[PDB]
């Protein structure tokens, strides 16, 4: 899997001019160092193995911090369960790495890291906690409380994680409706028409194919409420596998503003350096 | 028999240029029909050939000295272009490749350079703080196209927020630097070198066929990399003409006509 070896090149006095080209043609001049300067024979023992797409994407990346609480009812309101719509677009790094390409098709491997802590200095005593992470696909019922009937998870996939164990980990296949995931969608979901009763029938967001694209995850504690408040956070780590990508794009140069390609705040991404200053 | 002299013929139309650079086929793929192992809909597709696959000429844009750039979206630029626009509006699904020909002639005493970039899924940034609020009427300008702007003028009207784009020219309207846009399929119209550019675009999408009215697959952006200069005057302006021919056009699901509210 090694790189091509450098060929020996002597002096040249010829009608062939590999140095001159025209970038107006859209092609890049495929020169080797033997075509401009004299070169010795070098055998290359270097490889592009870690520059592959799989090696570029085989890292874990945090995409959500889901906060759940476990306390008995009081005058102050409580957050007994939490729900997160599945998207990668709210953290900048994995979104920037995925937005090098227009279309992608990968298998997917989630990992859940759960940490809990107290908030009251008076007692500090609580038992071990068991966390339920239920996948809710689009259109399926969503929980209205931490103890209602949707948590019975008859058809929905569910992970029961006990605290202190090794982090929970599952694989998801390619679930997308198209033959590739579309990172960028230059279009609308609905077209406003001349026969519409008002403009709000056909109005839709630009660059948004579907709302609730991949479903939501629900996190709760299955235990009864301890007398003191225990605040837990579930960190979700994305790792693409078997990754195939198409149509390379330039990376993002300005700070992200929402799920679209909108820019607002900085727009000044290059510094000052003089023309004749090294 | 040099590559500077080129003849393109499609249907009843023919383009001859004597100072081309070359022809770029985007990603090495010529346009093709759907083969049987990729066909998702079951209805027999309409392939009009000659009635749709012909060169259509848009409005000429005037390249003044202080101009910043122009952009178009396909197939939206051909929404009024005869039987292709009619077949686009009478059908639910459509697939076509394109041949984009940009014409910009100037004398040997003129100088300047244009970058003709072909961007798949050319999303453009909004004009205001409300994210992704750009309307369908402003996002689809048709054959008129749009223009780039030299700065983000933040639109802040209390009522009627205009729902437009604000494509910043060095940011290509999408937050990526203009110098890195050469990974898109591209040709440069350098006035000392060539007067025309040809890019052949295959159908690029995550689906085998898609709605052409809802979705624009390709975007064409023309930006002056070097500004236009002439001998000691400021009023110089030369015309730029963009010509697009659909290729391997096919349309699957027939229904009554679409009348969008522009």
């Amino acid at each position, epitope marked *: 899997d090694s790189l091509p070896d450098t060929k020996a090149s002597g002096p040249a006095h010829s009608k062939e001019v590999p140095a001159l080209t025209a970038v107006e043609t859209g092609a890049t001049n495929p020169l080797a160092p033997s075509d401009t300067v004299q070169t010795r024979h070098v055998v290359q023992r270097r490889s592009r193995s870690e520059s592959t797409i799989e090696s570029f994407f085989a890292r874990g990346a945090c995409v959500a911090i*889901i906060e759940v609480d476990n306390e008995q*009812p009081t005058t102050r309101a409580q957050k007994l369960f939490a*729900m997160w719509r599945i998207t990668y677009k709210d*953290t900048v790094q994995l979104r920037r790495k995925l937005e090098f390409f227009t279309y992608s098709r990968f298998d997917m491997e989630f990992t859940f890291v759960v940490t809990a802590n107290f908030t009251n200095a008076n007692n500090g005593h609580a038992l071990n906690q068991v966390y339920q992470i239920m996948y809710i696909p689009p259109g399926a019922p969503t929980p209205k409380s931490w103890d209602d009937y949707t948590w019975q998870t008859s058809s929905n996939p569910s992970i029961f994680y006990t605290y202190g164990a090794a982090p929970a980990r599952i694989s998801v296949p390619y679930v997308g409706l198209a033959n590739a995931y579309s990172h960028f969608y230059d279009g609308f979901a609905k077209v406003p028409l001349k026969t519409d009763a008002n403009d*709000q029938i056909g109005d839709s967001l630009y660059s948004a194919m579907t709302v609730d694209d991949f479903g939501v995850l629900a996190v709760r504690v299955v235990n009864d409420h301890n007398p003191t408040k225990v605040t837990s956070k579930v960190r979700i780590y994305m790792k693409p596998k078997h990754v195939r990508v198409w149509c390379p794009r330039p990376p993002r140069a300005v700070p992200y503003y929402g799920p679209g390609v909108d820019y607002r705040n900085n727009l000044d991404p290059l510094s000052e350096k003089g023309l004749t200053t090294y | 028999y040099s590559d500077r002299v080129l003849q393109l013929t499609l249907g009843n139309s023919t383009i001859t240029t004597q100072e081309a650079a070359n022809s770029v086929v985007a990603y090495g793929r010529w346009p093709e029909f759907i083969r049987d192992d990729e066909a998702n809909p079951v209805d027999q597709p309409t392939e009009p050939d000659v009635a749709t696959c012909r060169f259509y000429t848009l409005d000429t844009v005037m390249w003044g000295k202080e101009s910043k750039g122009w952009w178009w979206k396909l197939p939206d630029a051909l929404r009024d272009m005869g039987l292709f626009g009619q077949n686009m509006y009478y059908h639910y699904l459509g697939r076509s490749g394109y041949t984009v020909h940009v014409q910009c002639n100037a004398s040997k005493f003129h100088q300047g350079a244009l970058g003709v970039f072909a961007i798949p899924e050319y999303c453009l940034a909004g004009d205001s*703080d409300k994210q992704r609020y750009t309307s369908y009427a402003n996002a689809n300008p048709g054959e008129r196209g749009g223009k780039f702007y030299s700065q983000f003028n933040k639109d802040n009207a209390v009522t009627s927020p205009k729902r437009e784009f604000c494509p910043v020219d060095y940011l290509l309207g999408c937050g990526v630097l203009l110098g890195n846009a050469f990974v898109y399929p591209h040709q440069i119209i350098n006035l000392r070198t060539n007067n025309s550019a040809t890019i052949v675009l295959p159908y690029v999408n995550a689906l085998a066929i898609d709605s052409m009215v809802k979705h624009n697959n390709w975007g064409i952006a023309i930006l002056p990399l070097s500004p236009l200069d002439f001998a000691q005057d400021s009023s110089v302006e030369i015309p730029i003409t963009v010509t697009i021919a659909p290729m391997c056009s096919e349309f699957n699901g027939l229904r009554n006509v679409t009348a969008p509210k522009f």
Partner: antibody
Amino acid sequence: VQSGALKKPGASVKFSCQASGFTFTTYDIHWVRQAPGQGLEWMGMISPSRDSTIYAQKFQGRVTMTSDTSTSTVYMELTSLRSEDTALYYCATASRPSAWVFRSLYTYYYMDVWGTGTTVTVSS
Amino acid sequence: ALTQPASVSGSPGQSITISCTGTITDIGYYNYVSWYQQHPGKAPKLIIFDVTNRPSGVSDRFSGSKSGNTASLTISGLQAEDEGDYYCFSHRSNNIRVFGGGTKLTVL
């Protein structure tokens, strides 16, 4: 919540909203006004945990908001007032947490704790 | 401000739906749709916090739903103590918040 409990035309009017210390440091503080029969109207947000302030687009120039950690009080100054500003002005604490994760890193909060407010008349 | 009907009326024992229609973003994108109750002279009281969810102490005759750009509040089994104003609340994009126009409910 103590809302401070005013009339003059044109000149600037200052407001006060004092809360308990845990709710002051932990939760955001919002301002809502209500003209008689004209419905509710949002004014802005003070977050004393990080001193970040967001103002409504109708009120982005006229309204300035400060925080005070010593007496656990927030203050709002309307720098110039007009005759339409004759209204009942409320202070609200964002205490009710939502199930839905805001972006992917935060928790959204509605208000269910409201002050009794104060009435300001802008006329001679 | 979000559109609401100005006044709805009904006799006791009836079922009454009050509708709050916003726009794209707003009710249609976010699930941060809320409802408030205001009797004359009183502070506003939260009656529905998330779209279909009720706070503690709110009676079960209140209910809510979302159908798109429109969120509806349904009161089933109307009582005379339900007379007053109802205000819709939702989250708009770029982190601003906007109330509804308000609906006066009169128990006939």
